[PDB]
Design a protein around this ligand. Structure first.
Ligand SMILES: [Mg+2]
Ligand SMILES: [Mg+2]
Ligand SMILES: [Mg+2]
Ligand SMILES: [Mg+2]
Ligand SMILES: [Mg+2]
Ligand SMILES: [Mg+2]
Ligand SMILES: [Mg+2]
Ligand SMILES: [Mg+2]
Ligand SMILES: [Mg+2]
Ligand SMILES: [Mg+2]
Ligand SMILES: [Mg+2]
Ligand SMILES: [Mg+2]
Ligand SMILES: [Mg+2]
Ligand SMILES: [Mg+2]
Ligand SMILES: [Mg+2]
Ligand SMILES: [Mg+2]
Ligand SMILES: [Mg+2]
Ligand SMILES: [Mg+2]
Ligand SMILES: [Mg+2]
Ligand SMILES: [Mg+2]
Ligand SMILES: [Mg+2]
Ligand SMILES: [Mg+2]
Ligand SMILES: [Mg+2]
Ligand SMILES: [Mg+2]
Ligand SMILES: [Mg+2]
Ligand SMILES: [Mg+2]
Ligand SMILES: [Mg+2]
Ligand SMILES: [Mg+2]
Ligand SMILES: [Mg+2]
Ligand SMILES: [Mg+2]
Ligand SMILES: [Mg+2]
Ligand SMILES: [Mg+2]
Ligand SMILES: [Mg+2]
Ligand SMILES: [Mg+2]
Ligand SMILES: [Mg+2]
Ligand SMILES: [Mg+2]
Ligand SMILES: [Mg+2]
Ligand SMILES: [Mg+2]
Ligand SMILES: [Mg+2]
Ligand SMILES: [Mg+2]
Lengths: 101, 116, 87, 70
RNA sequence: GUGGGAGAGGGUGGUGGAAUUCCCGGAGUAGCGGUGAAAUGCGCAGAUACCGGGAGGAACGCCGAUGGCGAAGGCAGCCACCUGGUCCACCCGUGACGCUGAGGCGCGAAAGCGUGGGGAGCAAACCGGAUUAGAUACCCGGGUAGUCCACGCCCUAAACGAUGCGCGCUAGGUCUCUGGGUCUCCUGGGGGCCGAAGCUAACGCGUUAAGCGCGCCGCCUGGGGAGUACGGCCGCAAGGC
């Protein structure tokens, strides 16, 4: 198992009934693919640099997990299925390379 | 018959012609002119004089609809691309701002033999 | 790929003695494992030709060490080939 | 002119999510500054280019912008 | 072996924005386009220019470099999986296990061929417009095969560093990529520029040798005829050795 970082941006117009559903759906998808969650950072409403899906903002999520490597691309396929889910980018974790130290 | 009094003005300047369109803040055009709308016919349209007269013809057409404030957009390089702007500032229309939005691709399509 | 967990498993199995890391038997074992990792990677991905080159270099090196073992001590050569299922 | 690394602190060059600092490395347009203007090293600029492209796909850094002059 | 390291190295899938074309709507009149000038072309069935939305294919701007990777061909969005090569620190292990390499086998830009897809842009042939003494061309408008993908052939090149490979030896200075180090620097492995000795017909090369040596393979012996004829092998063909 390697360690990855998940970036999810969904439609920033959801109420709490839809936001809890979309997010607990992301929880259920991680359980089926064996993603041990290490920490979570939720930014939320953030000003986008260009329109995405005709919408000028986006609700941001970030998960750091440890999972088997072979199932990553099938996990990316499972997240983009949801309509509200718009951006899915999974990056292998890396060390914080410093500059001007 | 519109009474807009404010809007955008696009300048599409090529090496073969310079053409000006005047619109409203949403993008929909009001009037327009070019090097061919005025008497010039051939290569004379890609000249700075034609670029000046075309800019001023559209400006007087926008006065009919009551235009005072004007935001300027410019696309393309060519003779008279600057002479049209300089004509537009002294056209009575108080020029609000000037933006260059010339579309540059990310090397997506293969150009004609001319451009290679 | 090939983690150091699986690596130590092979070295300790084919070592002539504790601490031995570079015996000819140990080199051929390690070479053979990467052969089977690539030959299975080349069953699929049949159009990967740059990886195909590295496999020829490993086969040439594996046969280079076996041809050496054949000359010096032919017994350990047979005990090695029978243990890896080659030739 | 000053350079970006000269007027800055100790920052993470691999953090694609820190837009406040990565906006410093973009020009007036969405373009990426050359090394002459960022004051970075060879290896640093290569990492910055990749982490900027990541932020671009996350809607955080603009692909291209509009120049207000001329 | 151990521990680290950089990378358009490769293969597979996924994915992002810009732009071109086309469709839909909104708005909007008289031309746009193109050239040294023009004309064919397109436009009142409403184009060009502008806003919004959609479809599709192909190529990845800036970063980008005189840079990096690869045995060569060659490899540029991003993400992930699979994966090759290579380099450095430790001085740990085996104990000459090495070098080259006629055949063989595998790879091999583009173009072309077969089968089936795909088809936005570009574009042989070809259809036109000009130029011209003429235009079987450069310039202009259209446009098919093809360029893209899958599978199978084809084996050529300015396939270039016009420099086969490996090793040892022979002043340095300077720019650089990437490691390690007691980090004005030293020490490696590549990528450039000047230049000692020396070589070379000269231009020029010069620790990345074209220098001094050694091992092995390939090849050369006047031009035209001619990379043609015959024969053979290979190929569906074009044709290749
Ligand atoms: Mg979706
Ligand atoms: Mg003209
Ligand atoms: Mg790669
Ligand atoms: Mg690749
Ligand atoms: Mg329409
Ligand atoms: Mg007509
Ligand atoms: Mg008509
Ligand atoms: Mg008609
Ligand atoms: Mg179509
Ligand atoms: Mg460039
Ligand atoms: Mg080349
Ligand atoms: Mg690797
Ligand atoms: Mg020793
Ligand atoms: Mg020893
Ligand atoms: Mg001993
Ligand atoms: Mg060899
Ligand atoms: Mg051979
Ligand atoms: Mg070929
Ligand atoms: Mg081809
Ligand atoms: Mg074909
Ligand atoms: Mg064309
Ligand atoms: Mg043509
Ligand atoms: Mg003549
Ligand atoms: Mg004629
Ligand atoms: Mg010669
Ligand atoms: Mg020689
Ligand atoms: Mg250092
Ligand atoms: Mg190299
Ligand atoms: Mg060097
Ligand atoms: Mg001399
Ligand atoms: Mg000579
Ligand atoms: Mg020199
Ligand atoms: Mg030498
Ligand atoms: Mg010959
Ligand atoms: Mg003769
Ligand atoms: Mg020939
Ligand atoms: Mg004969
Ligand atoms: Mg023959
Ligand atoms: Mg035959
Ligand atoms: Mg021929």
């Amino acid at each position: 198992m390697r360690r990855y970082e998940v970036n999810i941006v969904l439609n920033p117009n959801l109420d709490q009934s839809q936001l809890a559903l979309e997010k607990e759906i992301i929880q259920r998808a991680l359980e089926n693919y064996g993603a041990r969650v290490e920490k979570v950072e939720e930014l939320g409403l953030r000003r986008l640099a260009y329109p995405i899906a005709k919408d000028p903002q986006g609700y941001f999520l970030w998960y750091q997990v440890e999972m088997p490597e072979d199932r990553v691309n099938d996990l990316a396929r499972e997240l983009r299925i949801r309509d509200n889910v718009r951006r899915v980018m999974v990056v292998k974790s890396q060390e914080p390379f410093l500059a001007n130290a | 018959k519109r009474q807009v009094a404010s809007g955008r003005a696009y300048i599409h300047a090529s090496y073969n012609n310079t053409i000006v369109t005047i619109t409203d803040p949403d993008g929909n055009p009001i009037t327009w002119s070019s090097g061919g709308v005025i008497g010039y016919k051939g290569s004379r349209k890609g000249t700075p004089y034609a670029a000046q007269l075309a800019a001023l013809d559209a400006a007087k057409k926008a006065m009919a609809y009551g235009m005072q404030s004007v935001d300027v957009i410019v696309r393309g390089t060519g003779a008279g691309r600057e002479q049209a702007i300089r004509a537009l500032q002294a056209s009575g229309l108080q020029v609000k701002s000037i933006v260059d939005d010339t579309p540059v691709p990310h090397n997506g399509c293969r150009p004609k033999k001319k451009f290679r | 790929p090939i983690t150091k967990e699986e690596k130590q498993k092979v070295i300790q199995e084919f070592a002539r003695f504790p601490g031995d890391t570079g015996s000819t038997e140990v080199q051929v074992a390690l070479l053979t494992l990467r052969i089977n990792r690539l030959s299975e990677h080349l069953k699929v991905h049949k159009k990967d030709h740059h990886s195909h080159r590295g496999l020829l270099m490993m086969v040439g090196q594996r046969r280079r060490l076996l041809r050496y073992l054949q000359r010096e001590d032919p017994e350990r050569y047979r005990a090695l080939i029978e243990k890896l299922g080659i030739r | 002119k000053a350079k970006v690394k000269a007027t800055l602190g100790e920052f993470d060059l691999r953090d694609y999510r820190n837009v406040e600092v990565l906006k410093r490395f973009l020009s007036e347009t969405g373009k990426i500054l050359p090394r002459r203007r960022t004051g970075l090293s060879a290896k640093e600029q290569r990492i910055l280019a990749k982490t900027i492209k990541r932020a671009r796909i996350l809607g955080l850094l603009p692909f291209t912008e509009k120049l207000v002059r001329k």
